[PDB]
Structures are given as structure tokens and as C-alpha cells.
Design an enzyme around this catalytic site. Sequence first.
Site, mmCIF file in Angstrom:
data_model
loop_
_atom_site.group_PDB
_atom_site.id
_atom_site.type_symbol
_atom_site.label_atom_id
_atom_site.label_comp_id
_atom_site.label_asym_id
_atom_site.label_seq_id
_atom_site.Cartn_x
_atom_site.Cartn_y
_atom_site.Cartn_z
ATOM 1 N N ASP A 168 46.567 88.214 14.879
ATOM 2 C CA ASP A 168 47.274 87.846 13.661
ATOM 3 C C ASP A 168 47.725 89.082 12.914
ATOM 4 O O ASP A 168 47.607 89.171 11.696
ATOM 5 C CB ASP A 168 46.368 86.985 12.791
ATOM 6 C CG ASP A 168 47.137 86.226 11.738
ATOM 7 O OD1 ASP A 168 48.385 86.170 11.825
ATOM 8 O OD2 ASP A 168 46.500 85.740 10.778
ATOM 9 N N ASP B 236 41.798 90.451 7.980
ATOM 10 C CA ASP B 236 42.033 89.069 8.353
ATOM 11 C C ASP B 236 41.711 88.690 9.810
ATOM 12 O O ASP B 236 42.607 88.436 10.642
ATOM 13 C CB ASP B 236 43.363 88.521 7.831
ATOM 14 C CG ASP B 236 43.324 86.999 7.632
ATOM 15 O OD1 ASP B 236 42.445 86.340 8.249
ATOM 16 O OD2 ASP B 236 44.149 86.458 6.847
ATOM 17 N N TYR C 216 40.989 77.871 3.670
ATOM 18 C CA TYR C 216 39.591 77.523 3.473
ATOM 19 C C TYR C 216 38.941 78.347 2.362
ATOM 20 O O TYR C 216 37.726 78.239 2.145
ATOM 21 C CB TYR C 216 38.764 77.593 4.770
ATOM 22 C CG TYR C 216 38.406 78.995 5.236
ATOM 23 C CD1 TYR C 216 37.571 79.838 4.489
ATOM 24 C CD2 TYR C 216 38.878 79.465 6.453
ATOM 25 C CE1 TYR C 216 37.255 81.134 4.940
ATOM 26 C CE2 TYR C 216 38.555 80.748 6.920
ATOM 27 C CZ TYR C 216 37.745 81.573 6.168
ATOM 28 O OH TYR C 216 37.459 82.829 6.676
HETATM 29 N N1 LIG Z 1 39.457 93.863 1.315
HETATM 30 C C1 LIG Z 1 40.425 93.460 0.477
HETATM 31 N N2 LIG Z 1 40.764 94.203 -0.610
HETATM 32 C C2 LIG Z 1 41.750 93.766 -1.417
HETATM 33 N N3 LIG Z 1 42.500 92.662 -1.315
HETATM 34 C C3 LIG Z 1 42.146 91.933 -0.231
HETATM 35 C C4 LIG Z 1 41.150 92.264 0.691
HETATM 36 N N4 LIG Z 1 41.062 91.295 1.687
HETATM 37 C C5 LIG Z 1 41.982 90.407 1.348
HETATM 38 N N5 LIG Z 1 42.633 90.695 0.179
HETATM 39 C C6 LIG Z 1 43.754 89.925 -0.349
HETATM 40 O O1 LIG Z 1 43.669 88.495 -0.248
HETATM 41 C C7 LIG Z 1 45.051 88.050 -0.020
HETATM 42 C C8 LIG Z 1 45.374 86.568 0.258
HETATM 43 O O2 LIG Z 1 44.353 85.757 0.898
HETATM 44 P P1 LIG Z 1 43.988 85.527 2.360
HETATM 45 O O3 LIG Z 1 43.029 86.567 2.881
HETATM 46 O O4 LIG Z 1 43.599 84.090 2.563
HETATM 47 O O5 LIG Z 1 45.040 86.454 3.227
HETATM 48 P P2 LIG Z 1 46.478 85.808 3.687
HETATM 49 O O6 LIG Z 1 47.072 86.687 4.759
HETATM 50 O O7 LIG Z 1 47.152 85.464 2.381
HETATM 51 O O8 LIG Z 1 46.097 84.631 4.804
HETATM 52 P P3 LIG Z 1 45.901 82.962 4.864
HETATM 53 O O9 LIG Z 1 46.388 82.377 3.549
HETATM 54 O O10 LIG Z 1 46.729 82.559 6.073
HETATM 55 O O11 LIG Z 1 44.398 82.779 4.968
HETATM 56 C C9 LIG Z 1 45.537 89.067 1.015
HETATM 57 O O12 LIG Z 1 46.961 89.095 1.175
HETATM 58 C C10 LIG Z 1 44.962 90.380 0.471
HETATM 59 O O13 LIG Z 1 45.828 91.183 -0.320
#
Ligand SMILES: Nc1ncnc2c1ncn2[C@@H]1O[C@H](COP(=O)(O)OP(=O)(O)OP(=O)(O)O)[C@@H](O)[C@H]1O
Lengths: 260, 298
Positions: free
Chosen positions: B127, B145, B15
Site C-alpha cells: 500500500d 500504514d 476502523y
Molecule cells: N506516526 C504518525 N505521525 C503523524 N501522523 C500520522 C502518523 N501515522 C499516521 N498519521 C496520520 O494519520 C492520517 C490519516 O489516517 P489513517 O492512518 O487511517 O491513514 P490513511 O492513509 O488516511 O489511510 P485509511 O483511511 O485508508 O486507513 C495519515 O494520513 C497520517 O498523516
Amino acid sequence: NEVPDYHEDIHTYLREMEVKCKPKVGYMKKQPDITNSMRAILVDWLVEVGEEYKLQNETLHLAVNYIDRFLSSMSVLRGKLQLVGTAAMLLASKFEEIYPPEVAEFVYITDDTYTKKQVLRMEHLVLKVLTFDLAAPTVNQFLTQYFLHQQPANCKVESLAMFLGELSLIDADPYLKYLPSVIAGAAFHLALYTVTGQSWPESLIRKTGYTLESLKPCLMDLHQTYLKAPQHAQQSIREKYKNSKYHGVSLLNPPETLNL
Amino acid sequence: MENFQKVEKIGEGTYGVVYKARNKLTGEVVALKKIRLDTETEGVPSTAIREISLLKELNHPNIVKLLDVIHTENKLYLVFEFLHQDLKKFMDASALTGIPLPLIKSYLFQLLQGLAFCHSHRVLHRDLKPQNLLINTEGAIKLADFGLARAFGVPVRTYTHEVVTLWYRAPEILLGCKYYSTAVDIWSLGCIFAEMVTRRALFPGDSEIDQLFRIFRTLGTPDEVVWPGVTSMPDYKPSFPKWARQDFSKVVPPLDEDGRSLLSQMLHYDPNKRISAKAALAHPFFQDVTKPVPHLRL
Ligand SMILES: Nc1ncnc2c1ncn2[C@@H]1O[C@H](COP(=O)(O)OP(=O)(O)OP(=O)(O)O)[C@@H](O)[C@H]1O
């Protein structure tokens, strides 16, 4: 959930949040078009809605809390009172349900009196007014916390306490003046007394700090609500609690004395 | 949104997308999660509704901070404190050299603190996997997350569309439990602890049956003496091979007698018997924890 390590902590935190989620006890006096009765009809309808969509009881309680909070600070015209009710239900479903009903259902349940967009914008408005503070403590939540002190568990007692607590949602009339932990304490003792003839456990006294004396004021009110229940103008809850799912507790006769 | 300078995409989502950004007035570095908004057929997504409202009650050094929500038209942005990287990449980065034991103990210790904090405020993370744990050059590790998070002041029901990635999935969920519990979160953590220690995923299943099988081959097939109730669970099969529990000495070679103890307790079959974050923090394993700093290859 089930790892005793946090039961206290969680209870304590809930007792704090409950005070902060509190809506204005006297907001209805200060409201122009709408009235306590208009509210009663709305909550009762939400109960139906819950039934029709198989939603949890928690989704109902939350939705009500969002409503009384939204109303303590936004003047709503009686014909928009339902738009607010519907957005509150949609929000509570999004928070609580495993997967909520689609906005379509919500616009549908209104016999189309409102549009999809009106439903969404009101959703944005409620979120703003509540400031994304949706994880509110409820009567249900406190009941759950209390049931853990049953020697031994009784699913009929539970159903009853859930019934009385749910009845309190209909009447801002007297209810808005009590903390959820309190209406919960009373619903639990009334239900328990009615069903097993026993009283508010010493373990719950130590746990909550409430004494039966403390619950008396709310106890008297819940009781009179219970007695007067078959005569109430709203019936959705009584009809719902006379199902096998709830051990037909709504048909269970209330004591004529709390012997308090 | 005008006070934000987008620096660089740092991620994607189902999303949303995450960019690194800078506040032009204050210079504060931040992570902006954008959400487009079904201003017709959905409205604010359920994930966003829960992440926001729950995260906003969780202010702790070991939990990524939600700084702001800029809600508007048909766009929703979540603004977060910013961290350098996640444990997944750090871990990869450390294959070869490995992550120093004192740094592992520090990371475990901090994650347990963030978790215990979550748990006592009635929030289940649900998660917990290496990529959802963020780290900084200073030696801090934070839970992140909260997209699958749920308040449990009233029992949380298991749903097949909301669940950890397989490797970190608890046995109960695999065996078809009805409700989640704090224990599921402690399980993920036990798995992560072993991964840092060995440089290899603990139970890298190919499927649910493969997953359960890998757990069984290691911990032994659960019986009623071990987990009163197993045999009755929804996806339990009497046909399951009966395996035996192996030596943790063989499972996690570098861990001392204390680190092995904590691990077996985090990997306990009976969810009502699995150690809690609150309790694990007491473990003698931490009686000398320190706060080393990682060598991030940023
Ligand atoms: N506070 C933060 N500081 C730096 N990078 C971040 C932060 N929060 C999230 N990110 C980065 O965003 C990346 C990818 O996007 P997303 O948060 O959608 O997480 P994901 O685990 O890849 O989960 P999903 O795709 O299932 O939503 C994460 O792997 C992370 O490294």
C-alpha cells in the site's frame, strides 16, 4: 515473492524466529487435566475444520503453534481445551486467510459448546499470552523454501512432504522436540526418496547446514509415523491427502527402509 | 490509557481515528490509533492483527515505530512514534518550488532501505502511496500504514478488497496475477519517484482499463518478448492497443542519465525482472546521496 534477492535473508530470519517461537518441549508433563492424546484429537479436528472451510494448510500450522505455545504457560482444563483450539484457529485465519470465517462459524463448529463471547475473550487471552507474536515460522514455510531447490520441480514430491509435515502436527508425542526446519528437512527427504528415489540435495545441505546425518533422528521418527499412519487413531490427514488435489499421496506406499 | 493527553485529531480510518498525543509522565509525543472493538461480532480486526504482529518485528529507522498496544475491553489503541507530515502534503506544498533533487534522492534512498528491510523479513507492504510515507523536519522519511501488510514466507494471494490505490497499482495486479510479490512494492516506489521529480502523478488512471492504458501509452504495450506470459494473463486482451515505449528523457525530463536508468528498472514489466530494493540501493544513482532537510510548512 519471486525475486531471488531475498531468499537467503528470509531463510536466515526464519531460522532465527523459529528458535524464539518455540514452545516448551515438556509442557504436557506439567499440565494437569489435558493430555497428548487430547491434543491429537484436537489437532485432527482442526484439520477437518480446515477442510470444511477451505482454509489453507498454513492456517492449520499456525493455529497449532499458537496452541502449543499457549499451553506451555497456561493450565487448561480438558473441557476448555477446545475453546483454546477454536480461538487459535480463528486467530490463524485472521492472520493468514484472505478473509477469515466469521466467529459465527467458529461457535457453530463447536456444536455450540461455547458462546460467541467466550470465543472472543479467549481470543483476547491468546493474543495477550502470545503477545501479538503471530507471524511464526512453520514446517509449511520451510518446505516452501526447500521446494525452490528441486531439480526439477515435482508436484507429487511436494504433496508428500506436505503430508508428512502435516502428520507431525498430530503427535506432540515425539514432535515437540524438533525445530520446524528439521521436521521440514526430514519430510522433504522422505517424500522425495519415496517418490523419486533421490536424496536430500547438496544444495539444501549447503543452504541449511543440515546433513542427512543431522536429519536421521527426526527421519527415523517421521518414517515410523508414515509406516504406522494407516493404523493411527487419527485419520483426518490421511483422508485429506488421498484426494486428487494431493495426488492421493497418503495411499502411496512408504519404503520399508530409508537405506540411511 | 490514563497516561495519555490527547492533543489533536490528526486523522481518520475505516476502523480507527488517529490523534496526536503526549505521554503525561514522560512527555513523549506520540500518535494513538484507536480501534473500537467488535466485542461480539468480530473481535480484533484482521487488519489490526496483521499490522501489530508484523510491525513489531520491523524496527528500522525508515519504518514508523509501533511503541505500544494497549489492548483491553472493547477498545484497542496502537501507539506509534510521531512524524510531522506525509509526502502527499509535502509534495502539494512543494508544487511551484518543487522538491530539490538531492532531497528526492535522499527520500528515495531511505524508502528503499526501509523497503529492503521489510522484504528480507518476509513482509510485503502492499500500500505504498505518498500519504503512507511520513517525514520529519530532520530529513527522515519512513514507511507507514501496514494495514494492508502481509508476511510472505508462503505466497500471498491477490484479493480485490486489499489493494493499493489505482495510481500506484502494478501492471500484474491489473492484468489479474494470482500472487503478489516484492515487485509490486518496487512499482509503487518507481511511480512515487517520478511524481516527486515531475510534480505530476505518473499514471493517474480513471479506472483499471484506463490505468493499464496510461501505463501502456508510456512504457509501451507489453508483448511476450518483454514479459513472457502477458498474453496469457487473466485480464489481458488481444484487443489492447499496441503502443510504443516513450523516451524517459521525455517522461522525466529533469532526471539525469543515472536517475532514468533506476526508474526504468523499477518500472520493469516482468515482475521477475523488476529491480529489487536491495539491488536498487547499489545503483550508481545513489553514489553521492546526502541527507538534506526539507522545508516543512508546519
Ligand atoms: N506516526 C504518525 N505521525 C503523524 N501522523 C500520522 C502518523 N501515522 C499516521 N498519521 C496520520 O494519520 C492520517 C490519516 O489516517 P489513517 O492512518 O487511517 O491513514 P490513511 O492513509 O488516511 O489511510 P485509511 O483511511 O485508508 O486507513 C495519515 O494520513 C497520517 O498523516
